[PDB]
Symmetry: D2
Subunit: 355 residues, 4 copies
Amino acid sequence: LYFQGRNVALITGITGQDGSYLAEFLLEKGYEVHGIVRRSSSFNTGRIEHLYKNPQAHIEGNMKLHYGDLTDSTCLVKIINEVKPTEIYNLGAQSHVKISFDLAEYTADVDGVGTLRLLDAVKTCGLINSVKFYQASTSELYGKVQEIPQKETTPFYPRSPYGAAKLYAYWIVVNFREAYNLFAVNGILFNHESPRRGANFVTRKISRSVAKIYLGQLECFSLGNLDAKRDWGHAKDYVEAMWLMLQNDEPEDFVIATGEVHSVREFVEKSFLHIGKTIVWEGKNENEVGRCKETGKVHVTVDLKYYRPTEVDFLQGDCTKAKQKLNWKPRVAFDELVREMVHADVELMRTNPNA
Amino acid sequence: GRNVALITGITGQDGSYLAEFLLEKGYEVHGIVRRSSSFNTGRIEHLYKNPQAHIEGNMKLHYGDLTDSTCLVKIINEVKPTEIYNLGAQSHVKISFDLAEYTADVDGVGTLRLLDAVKTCGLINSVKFYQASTSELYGKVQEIPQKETTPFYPRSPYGAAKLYAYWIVVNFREAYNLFAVNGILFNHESPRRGANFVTRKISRSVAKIYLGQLECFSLGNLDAKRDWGHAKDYVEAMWLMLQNDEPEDFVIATGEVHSVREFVEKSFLHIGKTIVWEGKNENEVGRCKETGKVHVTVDLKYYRPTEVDFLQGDCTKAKQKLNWKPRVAFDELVREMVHADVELMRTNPNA
Amino acid sequence: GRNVALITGITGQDGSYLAEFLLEKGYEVHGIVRRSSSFNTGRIEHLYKNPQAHIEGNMKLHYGDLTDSTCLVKIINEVKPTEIYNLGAQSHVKISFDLAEYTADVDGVGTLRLLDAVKTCGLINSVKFYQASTSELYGKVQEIPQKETTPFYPRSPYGAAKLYAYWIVVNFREAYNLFAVNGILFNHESPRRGANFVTRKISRSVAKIYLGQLECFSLGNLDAKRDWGHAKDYVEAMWLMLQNDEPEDFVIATGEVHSVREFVEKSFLHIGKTIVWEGKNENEVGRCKETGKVHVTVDLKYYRPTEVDFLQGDCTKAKQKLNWKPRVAFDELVREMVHADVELMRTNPNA
Amino acid sequence: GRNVALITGITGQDGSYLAEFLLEKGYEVHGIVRRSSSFNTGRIEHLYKNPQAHIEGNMKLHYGDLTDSTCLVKIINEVKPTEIYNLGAQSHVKISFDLAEYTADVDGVGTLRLLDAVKTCGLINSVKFYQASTSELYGKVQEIPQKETTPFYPRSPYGAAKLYAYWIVVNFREAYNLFAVNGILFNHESPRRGANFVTRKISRSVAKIYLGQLECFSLGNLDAKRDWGHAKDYVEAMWLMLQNDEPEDFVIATGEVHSVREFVEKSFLHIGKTIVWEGKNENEVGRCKETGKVHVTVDLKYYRPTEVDFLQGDCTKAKQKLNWKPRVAFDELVREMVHADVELMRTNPNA
Ligand SMILES: NC(=O)c1ccc[n+]([C@@H]2O[C@H](COP(=O)([O-])OP(=O)(O)OC[C@H]3O[C@@H](n4cnc5c(N)ncnc54)[C@H](OP(=O)(O)O)[C@@H]3O)[C@@H](O)[C@H]2O)c1
Ligand SMILES: NC(=O)c1ccc[n+]([C@@H]2O[C@H](COP(=O)([O-])OP(=O)(O)OC[C@H]3O[C@@H](n4cnc5c(N)ncnc54)[C@H](OP(=O)(O)O)[C@@H]3O)[C@@H](O)[C@H]2O)c1
Ligand SMILES: NC(=O)c1ccc[n+]([C@@H]2O[C@H](COP(=O)([O-])OP(=O)(O)OC[C@H]3O[C@@H](n4cnc5c(N)ncnc54)[C@H](OP(=O)(O)O)[C@@H]3O)[C@@H](O)[C@H]2O)c1
Ligand SMILES: NC(=O)c1ccc[n+]([C@@H]2O[C@H](COP(=O)([O-])OP(=O)(O)OC[C@H]3O[C@@H](n4cnc5c(N)ncnc54)[C@H](OP(=O)(O)O)[C@@H]3O)[C@@H](O)[C@H]2O)c1
Ligand SMILES: Nc1nc2c(ncn2[C@@H]2O[C@H](COP(=O)(O)OP(=O)(O)O[C@H]3O[C@@H](C(F)(F)F)[C@@H](O)[C@@H](O)[C@@H]3O)[C@@H](O)[C@H]2O)c(=O)[nH]1
Ligand SMILES: Nc1nc2c(ncn2[C@@H]2O[C@H](COP(=O)(O)OP(=O)(O)O[C@H]3O[C@@H](C(F)(F)F)[C@@H](O)[C@@H](O)[C@@H]3O)[C@@H](O)[C@H]2O)c(=O)[nH]1
Ligand SMILES: Nc1nc2c(ncn2[C@@H]2O[C@H](COP(=O)(O)OP(=O)(O)O[C@H]3O[C@@H](C(F)(F)F)[C@@H](O)[C@@H](O)[C@@H]3O)[C@@H](O)[C@H]2O)c(=O)[nH]1
Ligand SMILES: Nc1nc2c(ncn2[C@@H]2O[C@H](COP(=O)(O)OP(=O)(O)O[C@H]3O[C@@H](C(F)(F)F)[C@@H](O)[C@@H](O)[C@@H]3O)[C@@H](O)[C@H]2O)c(=O)[nH]1
Ligand SMILES: Nc1nc2c(ncn2[C@@H]2O[C@H](COP(=O)(O)OP(=O)(O)O)[C@@H](O)[C@H]2O)c(=O)[nH]1
Ligand SMILES: Nc1nc2c(ncn2[C@@H]2O[C@H](COP(=O)(O)OP(=O)(O)O)[C@@H](O)[C@H]2O)c(=O)[nH]1
Ligand SMILES: Nc1nc2c(ncn2[C@@H]2O[C@H](COP(=O)(O)OP(=O)(O)O)[C@@H](O)[C@H]2O)c(=O)[nH]1
Ligand SMILES: Nc1nc2c(ncn2[C@@H]2O[C@H](COP(=O)(O)OP(=O)(O)O)[C@@H](O)[C@H]2O)c(=O)[nH]1
């Protein structure tokens, strides 16, 4: 049964980057934390296995995991009915934009309709007035940005099947809030990174590749659009904002961002500086290369296979509303983020060159 | 010289008028029809070459479903259309609250399945694609009237699914140079409109009352306001949007607003009865002034959890670029629908 | 005790007869109806309390779909049935080859969704569940005649989907002690049979030929042999299966076999014509002895890629345990269908 | 000629051994990999041309999912494989009871999606298709031993989904003349086996106990009896089936039966411990004879609602027609698995 003082979180996507930090953040506050984990042929729990009570035996304590999938309605109802959460964080998703162009229907089913399935499970279980629901929305919703900077009232313009699926999810969450008075909020989070970031997102790809070059495991790597500009924060700061949004007296949507913009090119330059290399760019378009000023070796090339058919050229978030209402502020700035990711990947690649 | 149209949703209101419109222009018209335990082709069976033997001529029908990717690829490969009109949908807003996932799968993901089939079949640079978008996208309207630059604010699972479809069509246009357009059509009605949409519900019920086959019927929100046009005028806009030199999205509307209550009042005037209202909210009833008899009541079961209170479309862009303009105005629409349902109900009291 | 039935597929042939059968026994009958752009309730509209107003009495209808889990849970939680008859299906074998995935989703996974909805609602010990299984499971028959223990060998995507449904029903029975049964029904027909199944296609076409509305029609495999009963007899067997003390699977059939050719011959005799066959394979035609006119041809588009040549059911187990026996035999079934279709086609040549 | 394999499920146990096998035979090997938030390629990363940079040579990987029809068509159309091995599946029986619908969509309908992609792509005449069928199809075994003609009786949602897949493969073979075969493989294990299948759970746990990193572990049904072979031997059989001149289904098994209890006993013997059993049912424990410590308990949460008590395969047909025989017998299998897991746990106590 529900009672005041019992805090029970259900996290979809607990094995991902954000889920892993959010689980840690909520455990520290004394929550019982439940997560939904996909069945996989090998365990996919590497980011959260340190949160077992006994990590050698994989015995659970205050973090409890359940097999499920956002495409299986019955499994979501069974889990929610057993857990009776006070807070639900829907972080599960096919979260990669480039992959969404080749997996557009799967991305729609998980990222769009899966949000509806989870909301519908809350309603089926009779929990509409018992649970607070956080939806992981995204600055990708702004796509071809209609305003600079982007805030909660900037109109959406998605540019991928991922963005379209997340737009459905955004509005179905609003509809449950308005139709049924579910406390449900959209966190419109701008890009956020960490050493736990998926390896094929651009920041982690750069930090991994720079680490491999530093260690002699790699000579060169390829990127797509060097001129893309992004607002990059640290995932550990942003999961705190997710929790603050469910602590708010009223269910409101918020932009969470740093408000500071950098290019992919700058992320590359700063990463290489951390291994003592100055990158000099030469050429243009798909023939642009990044050369080490000291040695003259080409370390970065461009490959059109990494371009997106409809690029998101520029993102910059204005989080004034969150600063005023939630008293949220980012604590990690861009330069520290880059150093932390390169440093962590150098250590990772030293231990395991196949990592 | 080749004009081959493929219409999903050909059995519905709009598909039936669009089929007639394209046949009149000499198109070969193909339609996708759902398997049904009884035939669902009543609106188009007059377009068979031999309607007694159900033998096809220039309108050809194919079993399929917007939730079955393989069947869509198979049909598009066989037909090789030059124009595709995606009119198929679970199109009812109230039903979408109880069938939210089905509505997402057909109206949202089904649009992606059809676009993906176009791409799979190698047609991305030859076919022109029309998406049936909707004024329901404006939902809780952010401007009056609503135009192409008015932000969307959907208010039902139908609206949210159609918003996904709107943007996935834009993405296929922008990513792959598909000639694909969104028709943002405001409400449009006809004697072929589904019986549980408000206008046809009213005209059917008023017809039955005129013929003494019914005494009373119940509605939901009487003060909802809508921009109502005639479906036969609007399918022409769909075709015009694919004739345009460049693929653009357009609002199609009359720009004139009336309430459900006004549709009731005008419908009853056509059968010689003046409705006067008494009471409030779910206790409001509509009584014939001349006889004192109650003919209209309100039932909360017909309300929607999140209502769309007001729609009024501004189709300036379509007027200027497509030269489209509506022909049937509200008063004629009501008269036409009441007259047609009187003729139908005369033939069959159970209709 | 409470007698509340939930019928999926209530608008179909069997659902319409089962609803009548259960209403006569005093049940409250609930059905799940697909949203459709025209109403699909023609077989059951006479069961409204007021058929002119479409007001429900003891038969109550709910919009839903076997591919929407949430909707199924909502309906089962509202209705709390004591008996569930899962008759809803894409039931056409030929169309299943073009709609294989949709047929799997509705006929196979939909049965699982309904069973899971029962379990989700906490009714696993409180409901009896009937699954509409089919002689198509025997496909390439491994025994003649076929009984409950005959090994299955399906021959179409419909057969495969129904076989999944058969085994998931058995698994719910064995794993969770659900009172769930498979009715393995052989072909059953009626004047309400879908028009594109072979028996109704023949009876409709013979009627149209009698009335001068049609000259000729085409069939597929004339040599297919079937065990054909009357749907009205067979819905009684479904009910008897849920009255049984223990959940058991049963074959329901006549045990008598006739060819499609024979059904054609007997149907034409009821309009006073003796059909005489000439030619072979795709060139075979049936000609009226009295007039010399060709009335039947063969068209390969009606062949199935993997035919089911022969079905003959052995219903000894049901005769012994349920005291079930069919009341309508083949000759009376034919007469009834031809007679009903002449009446229908006289009233409407486009029917 | 051209030898290009497409392996779904390449990241799994069998896919990793099959990829190795086909690369050694000179094939270009393509694999479909699911998007995952961390890479799921641990079993095959040594097959990159440069494993430090994850650069591909003769093994090429493609993102996809068996539930996404468009992605399968794109991959198959790009690869143009000569052989397709459908190993991708939710392959865990206990998990299938909680994930019944997902298991149906991937293991059942996903097989149809892959077959339909072959057909869509025009490859029906140029590809050989292997389906990963399973002795779980026999479930409550209807013959002992089980062979190709033994009737199936599945006992889980996994079994039911794989039964759908088996018959849809047969139907593509018979309807469209696709060279498509069902490998009916009995249980096969290796040091790459998923950690929550019973053999690998035992070997992992015995290794952790040996190294003092675990005290005890729990099992479900100790008395279940299985036919266990080595995955490395069995992937050769898959390839042999597609080398056959005619498409036939084959049982692949050892024909030797052992219990879970015996697997436990033999595993502990390899670390120098004699397990002795005391108690009954869920209170049964396995105790070290030497030290008196309890190392094995029983937990009903690992029981399946409908167990498969006994499997024993008869692979006479494969021995005659394929000249296949297993190289690894049960005793060596146990030894290899415990030794491998000891070596793993020495490197990483959290493994
Ligand atoms: N990081 C950003 O910059 C950012 C910005 C805004 C919004 N977002 C959104 O925020 C959320 C978390 O981001 P992230 O960076 O943590 O993404 P991530 O690392 O890619 O984690 C995705 C999670 O979702 C799970 N998942 C995927 N498909 C699923 C399914 N069908 N059913 C259930 N679970 C499934 C994954 O499981 P596996 O481990 O099994 O793959 C993983 O746990 C996502 O919804 C993402 O779209 C991210
Ligand atoms: N009328 C309006 O005021 C209005 C306004 C803007 C946009 N729209 C959109 O315009 C389009 C047509 O409107 P309408 O009034 O003609 O709607 P309609 O009469 O309800 O017709 C709906 C059509 O879609 C078909 N359909 C439904 N589910 C399907 C599925 N799963 N697969 C394939 N076909 C399916 C229906 O087939 P059955 O006959 O088998 O049910 C019917 O042919 C719809 O997309 C509607 O949402 C309508
Ligand atoms: N008649 C036989 O000889 C025979 C023999 C053995 C087994 N069966 C099985 O017995 C059952 C009834 O047979 P029938 O002859 O009555 O079939 P039918 O006339 O084709 O009726 C099929 C019913 O299922 C409904 N339905 C179809 N797809 C649906 C979906 N996605 N969600 C919900 N409902 C859906 C149809 O609704 P619409 O009206 O909207 O299409 C109709 O009510 C079927 O399962 C059939 O496969 C028939
Ligand atoms: N081993 C046996 O004893 C045995 C006996 C007979 C038959 N089988 C069948 O043989 C095949 C392989 O067995 P295994 O032991 O190698 O199983 P496994 O280790 O569990 O591998 C399962 C594979 O399928 C992939 N997969 C899961 N869901 C998928 C999806 N939705 N789309 C695409 N790929 C997906 C998995 O990817 P992730 O790595 O991303 O999870 C993995 O590559 C399976 O079909 C299994 O059912 C096994
Ligand atoms: N541990 C690990 N790391 C990998 C793997 N593949 C790539 N990377 C690292 O990922 C980062 C970005 O590389 P990318 O090419 O931008 O990533 P993609 O995900 O787009 O493509 C990768 O897909 C793989 C998949 F199997 F998923 F299809 C393979 O095809 C691989 O060759 C390809 O690079 C870099 O740091 C890589 O080292 C892998 O299997 N295991
Ligand atoms: N021919 C016909 N007309 C019908 C039928 N049901 C309603 N109407 C007419 O439709 C108009 C609107 O009535 P509504 O109540 O607003 O329509 P809904 O679709 O919301 O609800 C209807 O659903 C039916 C369904 F079976 F689909 F669930 C039944 O439950 C029916 O009782 C209910 O009215 C009016 O003019 C009606 O005459 C029917 O079966 N056959
Ligand atoms: N009332 C009505 N009857 C029809 C219709 N089409 C066929 N029949 C009658 O059905 C019987 C069987 O004919 P079939 O050709 O064996 O039926 P199919 O379902 O295989 O094919 C039919 O499909 C239709 C569909 F639209 F669904 F795709 C059209 O293509 C139609 O031309 C074709 O006959 C006969 O008695 C017919 O008179 C129709 O639209 N309305
Ligand atoms: N490396 C690793 N090994 C694990 C993990 N969990 C279990 N094991 C090992 O698996 C073997 C079998 O254990 P089981 O309990 O029979 O396995 P299940 O898959 O049924 O259940 C497991 O599910 C997990 C999941 F997150 F997936 F839900 C967690 O709940 C975990 O506590 C539970 O054991 C043993 O050798 C374990 O060491 C893990 O996260 N990482
Ligand atoms: N993932 C990825 N992104 C790249 C690459 N090269 C440039 N980018 C750009 O980097 C930006 C951020 O991409 P990503 O990290 O995947 O996050 P996104 O904002 O969700 O698309 C996008 O504009 C990409 O187009 C590359 O090799 N991989
Ligand atoms: N369908 C329907 N709508 C009603 C009824 N009573 C009032 N309305 C209102 O009429 C308006 C138009 O409804 P509808 O014809 O279904 O078309 P919509 O604009 O797409 O929702 C909506 O605001 C409804 O809430 C009723 O009985 N049925
Ligand atoms: N539906 C249909 N079946 C035909 C036709 N001609 C021959 N048949 C055969 O009649 C038999 C019964 O078919 P049908 O009535 O559809 O029921 P089924 O037994 O479920 O396939 C099958 O063997 C068909 O192949 C035809 O024109 N239509
Ligand atoms: N996975 C698993 N199986 C167990 C356990 N204890 C007993 N078994 C039995 O071991 C047998 C083989 O199980 P498994 O390795 O998962 O493969 P399966 O034959 O496909 O079910 C089954 O009869 C299980 O019930 C356990 O803890 N885990």
